[PDB]
């Protein structure tokens, strides 16, 4: 018989329509011989709305604007519990995952800690340094430190960084290029109105390279792809890089996945200069996942189709759930 999947999408976000696009794309691709699929739409105001047993192709976005949260997740329209929930969502700080955890629903992708520790750039860049992964010169610090010891942060910038620099909210868009200290201070002032944690990174001129990784305990990595502002002077997959650079990038991605302790997936984004110096920029525990997003296309280039990827992520979710149950039994026993 079929397994029972629930795709959850929408959310209270500025990425609301992207989420719906992703749901459309995933729905139109999920292997419907294996899976009986229900969907849940979370409205812009957080009202949860359900539709059972999607079977036809979704022609339009408009269809997915559907017209007790616990009650919706705990049973499928076959009467059975879900074998897995696919979150496609604010819903990227690890909170929805905690909800799945408490309701004991198996779920696709990263768990609470790895979700939260990829959205917090200060924690992420500290884990990267612990792994020995090369990074561009930077500093990270808390608002409460800058408010009381400004001079000590500004001294570090002077000693460690060269202009231009990028002021980056560690959580949250607020990202600003700064060419001197006056701009730096205004960039910090602005970022700190809304976030209480910040990263300042030295500006670089480099290509943006990304690697997709898939798995739980035995992750595998794709050949890298490239994000360009224009292809003629957009995605390009594979990336035009020397063999040994690609191999190094693949291995750094796997390492970054292990250090941050991801589940299911991660996209690792790097900077690569013209003379092939590599720097890890960040991990994305919830990368873009439309039919034409970098994460799935990188896997398309490895011979892994969009339907099969979706199926693989589902299997990895069941596996992680089972693994957690075992260890719980073992702990309760001893």
Ligand X SMILES: Nc1ncnc2c1ncn2[C@@H]1O[C@H](COP(=O)(O)OP(=O)(O)NP(=O)(O)O)[C@@H](O)[C@H]1O
Q: Which residues are annotated as a binding site for ATP?
A: 158-210
Is the Cβ of residue 101 or residue 308 nearer to a second copy in the bound state?
A: 101
- Give min distance, CB of 160 to a second copy, in A: 13
Is 289 a binding residue for ligand X by CB under 6 A? The answer is no
Is 98 a binding residue for ligand X by CB under 6 A? The answer is no
Is the Cβ of residue 257 or residue 271 nearer to Cl ion in the bound state?
A: 257
Return d(Cα 169, Cα 160) in angstroms, integer.
19
Which of a second copy, ligand X, Cl ion, none binds 154 (CB below 5-8 Å, type-dependent)? none
Biggest alpha carbon–alpha carbon distance for the chain: 66
φ, ψ for residue 296, nearest 5 deg: -70, -30
Kindly indicate which of the ranges 87-95, 187-195, 200-208, 231-239 contains the residues binding ligand X, using the contact rule CB under 6 A.
Answer: 200-208
- Give min distance, CB of 180 to a second copy, in A: 24
Which of ligand X, a second copy, Cl ion, none binds 136 (CB below 5-8 Å, type-dependent)? ligand X
Is the Cβ of residue 101 or residue 315 nearer to a second copy in the bound state?
A: 101
Is the Cβ of residue 56 or residue 331 nearer to a second copy in the bound state?
A: 331
Return d(Cα 300, Cα 38) in angstroms, integer.
26
Judge contact between 226 and 297, C-beta under 8 A. Answer: no
Return d(Cα 137, Cα 172) in angstroms, integer.
21
Which of ligand X, Cl ion, a second copy, none binds 112 (CB below 5-8 Å, type-dependent)? a second copy
Spacing of C-alpha 88 from chain mean position:
10
**Beta strand 207-215 with 220-221: parallel, antiparallel or unpaired?**
antiparallel
Which of ligand X, Cl ion, a second copy, none binds 29 (CB below 5-8 Å, type-dependent)? none
Beta strands, E only, 19-142: 35-42, 48-51, 84-87, 138-142
Is the Cβ of residue 28 or residue 171 nearer to ligand X in the bound state?
A: 171
**Residues 6 or more apart from 300 whose CB is under 8 A from it?**
237, 306
Is 269 a binding residue for ligand X by CB under 6 A? The answer is yes
Is the Cβ of residue 123 or residue 204 nearer to ligand X in the bound state?
A: 204
**Residues 6 or more apart from 52 whose CB is under 8 A from it?**
38, 76, 77
Judge contact between 104 and 134, C-beta under 8 A. Answer: no
Per CB under 5 A, contacts with Cl ion among 199-228 are 215-218
Bridge partners (DSSP) of residue 6 are: 38, 85
Instruction: Spell out, one character per residue from 202 to 241, where the chain touches ligand X: x when CB under 6 A holds, - when not.
Output: -xx---x---------------------------------
Is residue 50 packed enough to be buried (19+ CB in 10 Å), middle (13-18) or exposed (0-12)? middle
Write out the residues near a second copy by the rule CB under 8 A. Answer: 12, 14, 46, 68-71, 90, 93-99, 101-104, 112-113, 116-117, 119-120, 122-123, 126-127, 129-130, 140, 142-145, 172-173, 193-197, 217-218, 258-259, 261, 323, 327-328, 330-332, 334
Which of Cl ion, ligand X, a second copy, none binds 38 (CB below 5-8 Å, type-dependent)? none
Helix (H, G, I), strand (E, B) or coil at 205: coil
Is the Cβ of residue 193 or residue 205 nearer to a second copy in the bound state?
A: 193
Q: What is the DSSP letter of 275?
A: T
* Residue tagged 């860049």 (tokens): 125
Between the alpha carbon of residue 287 and those of residues 111, 131, 259, 315, the distances in Å are 14, 22, 18, 19
Q: Which residues are annotated as a binding site?
A: 158-210, 269, 282, 284
Chain contacts with ligand X (rule: CB under 6 A): 136, 166, 168, 175, 201, 203-204, 208, 269, 281-282
Chain contacts with Cl ion (rule: CB under 5 A): 215-218
């Amino acid at each position: 018989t079929k397994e029972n999947i629930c795709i959850v999408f929408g959310g209270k976000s500025a990425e609301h329509e992207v989420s719906i696009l992703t749901a459309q794309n995933v729905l139109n691709a999920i292997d419907k011989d294996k899976y009986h699929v229900d969907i849940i739409y979370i409205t812009n105001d957080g009202d949860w709305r359900k539709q059972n047993n999607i079977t036809a192709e979704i022609k339009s976005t408009d269809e997915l604007h559907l017209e007790e949260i616990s009650q919706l997740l705990k049973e499928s329209s076959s009467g059975q519990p879900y074998d897995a929930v696919f979150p496609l969502l604010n819903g990227e700080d690890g909170t929805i995952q905690g909800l799945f955890e408490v309701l004991d629903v198996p779920y696709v992708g990263n768990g609470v800690l790895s979700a939260a520790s990829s959205m917090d750039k200060l924690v992420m860049k500290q884990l990267f340094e612990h792994r020995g992964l090369p990074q561009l010169p930077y500093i990270s610090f808390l608002r409460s430190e800058y408010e009381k010891y400004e001079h000590n942060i500004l001294k570090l910038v002077n000693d460690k960084l060269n202009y231009p620099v990028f002021v980056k909210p560690a959580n949250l868009v607020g990202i600003s290029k700064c060419n001197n200290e006056a701009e730096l201070k205004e960039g910090i002032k602005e970022a700190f109105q809304f976030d209480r944690k910040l990263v300042i990174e030295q500006g670089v001129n480099a290509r943006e390279i990304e690697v997709a990784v898939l798995g739980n305990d035995y992750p595998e990595a794709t050949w890298p792809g490239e994000v360009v502002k224009d292809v003629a002077f957009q995605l390009k997959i594979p990336a035009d890089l020397d063999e040994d650079v690609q191999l190094t990038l693949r291995n750094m991605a796997l390492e970054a996945f292990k250090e941050t302790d991801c589940s299911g997936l991660v996209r690792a984004d790097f900077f690569v200069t013209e003379d092939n110096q590599i720097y890890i920029n960040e991990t994305n525990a919830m990368p873009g996942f439309t039919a034409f997003s970098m994460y799935p296309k990188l896997w398309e280039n490895m011979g892994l189709s969009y339907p099969e990827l979706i199926t693989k992520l589902i299997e990895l979710a069941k596996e992680r759930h089972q693994d957690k149950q075992k260890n719980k039994y073992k702990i309760d026993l001893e």
